[PDB]
Design an enzyme around this catalytic site. Sequence first.
Site, PDB file in Angstrom:
ATOM      1  CG  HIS A  43     -16.401  -9.073 -10.260  1.00 52.04           C
ATOM      2  ND1 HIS A  43     -16.631 -10.809  -9.445  1.00 52.04           N
ATOM      3  CD2 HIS A  43     -15.097  -9.058 -10.762  1.00 52.04           C
ATOM      4  CE1 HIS A  43     -14.929 -11.080  -9.650  1.00 52.04           C
ATOM      5  NE2 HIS A  43     -14.518 -10.134 -10.242  1.00 52.04           N
ATOM      6  CG  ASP A  99     -19.179 -12.032  -8.983  1.00 53.68           C
ATOM      7  OD1 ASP A  99     -19.635 -11.885 -10.375  1.00 53.68           O
ATOM      8  OD2 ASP A  99     -18.371 -12.736  -8.972  1.00 53.68           O
ATOM      9  CB  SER A 198     -12.604 -12.558 -11.029  1.00 52.29           C
ATOM     10  OG  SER A 198     -12.207 -12.059  -9.862  1.00 52.29           O
TER      11      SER A 198
HETATM   12  P1  LIG Z   1     -10.749 -11.155 -10.082  1.00 50.53           P
HETATM   13  O1  LIG Z   1      -9.375 -11.600 -10.202  1.00 50.53           O
HETATM   14  O2  LIG Z   1     -11.509 -10.075 -10.488  1.00 50.53           O
HETATM   15  C1  LIG Z   1     -10.266  -8.862 -10.854  1.00 50.53           C
HETATM   16  C2  LIG Z   1      -9.372  -7.950 -10.145  1.00 50.53           C
HETATM   17  C3  LIG Z   1      -9.183  -7.011 -10.528  1.00 50.53           C
HETATM   18  C4  LIG Z   1      -8.623  -7.207 -12.039  1.00 50.53           C
HETATM   19  C5  LIG Z   1      -8.583  -8.074 -12.820  1.00 50.53           C
HETATM   20  C6  LIG Z   1      -9.857  -9.177 -12.196  1.00 50.53           C
HETATM   21  C7  LIG Z   1     -10.871 -10.561  -7.594  1.00 50.53           C
HETATM   22  N1  LIG Z   1     -12.012 -10.152  -7.182  1.00 50.53           N
HETATM   23  C8  LIG Z   1     -12.068  -8.890  -7.411  1.00 50.53           C
HETATM   24  O3  LIG Z   1     -11.301  -8.334  -7.029  1.00 50.53           O
HETATM   25  C9  LIG Z   1     -13.693  -8.541  -6.284  1.00 50.53           C
HETATM   26  C10 LIG Z   1     -13.894  -7.554  -7.386  1.00 50.53           C
HETATM   27  C11 LIG Z   1     -15.274  -6.679  -6.875  1.00 50.53           C
HETATM   28  C12 LIG Z   1     -14.249  -6.198  -5.836  1.00 50.53           C
HETATM   29  N2  LIG Z   1     -13.340  -7.812  -5.283  1.00 50.53           N
HETATM   30  C13 LIG Z   1     -12.776  -8.073  -4.263  1.00 50.53           C
HETATM   31  O4  LIG Z   1     -12.530  -9.300  -3.789  1.00 50.53           O
HETATM   32  C14 LIG Z   1     -12.066  -7.419  -3.052  1.00 50.53           C
HETATM   33  C15 LIG Z   1     -13.773  -8.019  -1.979  1.00 50.53           C
HETATM   34  C16 LIG Z   1     -15.172  -7.099  -2.536  1.00 50.53           C
HETATM   35  C17 LIG Z   1     -16.300  -8.091  -1.851  1.00 50.53           C
HETATM   36  C18 LIG Z   1     -17.627  -7.868  -1.101  1.00 50.53           C
HETATM   37  C19 LIG Z   1     -17.526  -6.687  -1.959  1.00 50.53           C
HETATM   38  C20 LIG Z   1     -16.844  -5.871  -3.191  1.00 50.53           C
HETATM   39  C21 LIG Z   1     -15.588  -5.604  -2.443  1.00 50.53           C
HETATM   40  N3  LIG Z   1     -11.259  -7.455  -2.085  1.00 50.53           N
HETATM   41  S1  LIG Z   1      -9.983  -7.332  -3.054  1.00 50.53           S
HETATM   42  O5  LIG Z   1     -10.151  -6.231  -4.029  1.00 50.53           O
HETATM   43  O6  LIG Z   1      -8.491  -7.654  -1.996  1.00 50.53           O
HETATM   44  C22 LIG Z   1      -9.098  -8.508  -4.527  1.00 50.53           C
HETATM   45  C23 LIG Z   1      -8.202  -8.586  -5.140  1.00 50.53           C
HETATM   46  C24 LIG Z   1      -8.188  -7.455  -6.172  1.00 50.53           C
HETATM   47  C25 LIG Z   1      -6.632  -7.261  -6.847  1.00 50.53           C
HETATM   48  C26 LIG Z   1      -5.946  -7.555  -6.190  1.00 50.53           C
HETATM   49  C27 LIG Z   1      -5.619  -8.507  -4.706  1.00 50.53           C
HETATM   50  C28 LIG Z   1      -7.129  -9.162  -4.326  1.00 50.53           C
HETATM   51  C29 LIG Z   1      -9.852 -11.822  -6.363  1.00 50.53           C
HETATM   52  C30 LIG Z   1     -10.555 -13.295  -6.922  1.00 50.53           C
HETATM   53  C31 LIG Z   1     -10.888 -14.139  -6.155  1.00 50.53           C
HETATM   54  C32 LIG Z   1      -9.035 -13.526  -4.556  1.00 50.53           C
HETATM   55  C33 LIG Z   1      -9.378 -14.589  -3.737  1.00 50.53           C
HETATM   56  N4  LIG Z   1      -9.585 -15.793  -3.656  1.00 50.53           N
HETATM   57  N5  LIG Z   1      -7.955 -14.445  -2.804  1.00 50.53           N
HETATM   58  C34 LIG Z   1      -8.719 -12.602  -5.429  1.00 50.53           C
HETATM   59  C35 LIG Z   1      -9.471 -11.730  -6.067  1.00 50.53           C
END
Ligand SMILES: *[PH](O)(Oc1ccccc1)[C@@H](NC(=O)[C@@H]1CCCN1C(=O)[C@@H](CC1CCCCC1)NS(=O)(=O)Cc1ccccc1)c1ccc(C(=N)N)cc1
Lengths: 250, 11, 28
Positions: A43, A99, A198
């Site tokens: 992703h 992923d 991520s």
């Molecule tokens: P990662 O850091 O990727 C990223 C995101 C934004 C900018 C640069 C890099 C991040 N991963 C994600 O955001 C993934 C990608 C699709 C949406 N997502 C989520 O984590 C989302 C839940 C998914 C579950 C499966 C179905 C689609 C939705 N939740 S979120 O949007 O709350 C995540 C988030 C985004 C921005 C700010 C805070 C939280 C990522 C990976 C891991 C974590 C963690 N361990 N808490 C958080 C973010």
Amino acid sequence: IVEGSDAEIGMSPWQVMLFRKSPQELLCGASLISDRWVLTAAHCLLYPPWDKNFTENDLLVRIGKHSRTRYERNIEKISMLEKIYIHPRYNWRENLDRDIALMKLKKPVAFSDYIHPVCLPDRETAASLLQAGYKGRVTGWGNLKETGQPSVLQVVNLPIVERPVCKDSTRIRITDNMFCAGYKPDEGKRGDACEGDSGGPFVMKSPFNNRWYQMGIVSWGEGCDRDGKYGFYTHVFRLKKWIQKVIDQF
Amino acid sequence: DFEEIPEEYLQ
Amino acid sequence: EADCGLRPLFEKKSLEDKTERELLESYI
Ligand SMILES: *[PH](O)(Oc1ccccc1)[C@@H](NC(=O)[C@@H]1CCCN1C(=O)[C@@H](CC1CCCCC1)NS(=O)(=O)Cc1ccccc1)c1ccc(C(=N)N)cc1
Ligand SMILES: *[C@@H]1O[C@H](CO)[C@@H](O)[C@H](O)[C@H]1NC(C)=O
Ligand code: NA
Ligand code: NA
């Protein structure tokens, strides 16, 4: 990384930064698995719900870094991408199942004190170490809290969580290609990956041969470091046959 | 926000 | 690689980092 600490120099020499060319910005973490191959989350490269579909020429990888924003002259190395490979059954429509993605570098990177590949687990090391309560290590330059950004690479150690607790923490459908990690509310300690982490590695140090193995890829989480939520990670060993198939063919 | 990287990498 | 997972500034010179012991202690 939330509630982590500054990395030591050379602590995570497989750490890779995925860097957008224009505008210049951090996109994701990644990891070095050989002198020509970098592992990340699918992703980070392909996510149609956010109109994300990067091609090779859109991106650079920066290897050997410590500082988030500095150009670390004589230390980091910057590599162009030859080809992106995304898992053919990566499920961006539903739950980010599988992923995982590989990036082949145009030229091999020279190893150094700051640049060195991580191991990928064998079946036996995975079975031994992927157990609830066993701790791994997550690293990255992502945000320091959900709602700012670090000067240098951050590190946090987190315990693997029992699969029923992972499942009961979320409405998302969890699969065998995921695991979750983090402290429970009653455990006191805290920490999680966050936005920008991520694609980076969840590693464990084998007590059998004293080598670091990448067991997970930072994949998704609901917010960051929320009580009762856990970070979810791509299960690297479960997808290793695809990894090897790509490397052997290309 | 980020320091400029050498031009050789952006060609 | 034959040398994978052995860090030049730690395992290769038999130096430990400040928190790897926390991981080892969890491998019960
Ligand atoms: P990662 O850091 O990727 C990223 C995101 C934004 C900018 C640069 C890099 C991040 N991963 C994600 O955001 C993934 C990608 C699709 C949406 N997502 C989520 O984590 C989302 C839940 C998914 C579950 C499966 C179905 C689609 C939705 N939740 S979120 O949007 O709350 C995540 C988030 C985004 C921005 C700010 C805070 C939280 C990522 C990976 C891991 C974590 C963690 N361990 N808490 C958080 C973010
Ligand atoms: C992503 O982009 C590539 C090339 O730009 C294209 O071949 C592919 O169909 C795109 N996939 C999606 C899901 O948009
Ligand atoms: Na559930
Ligand atoms: Na939590």
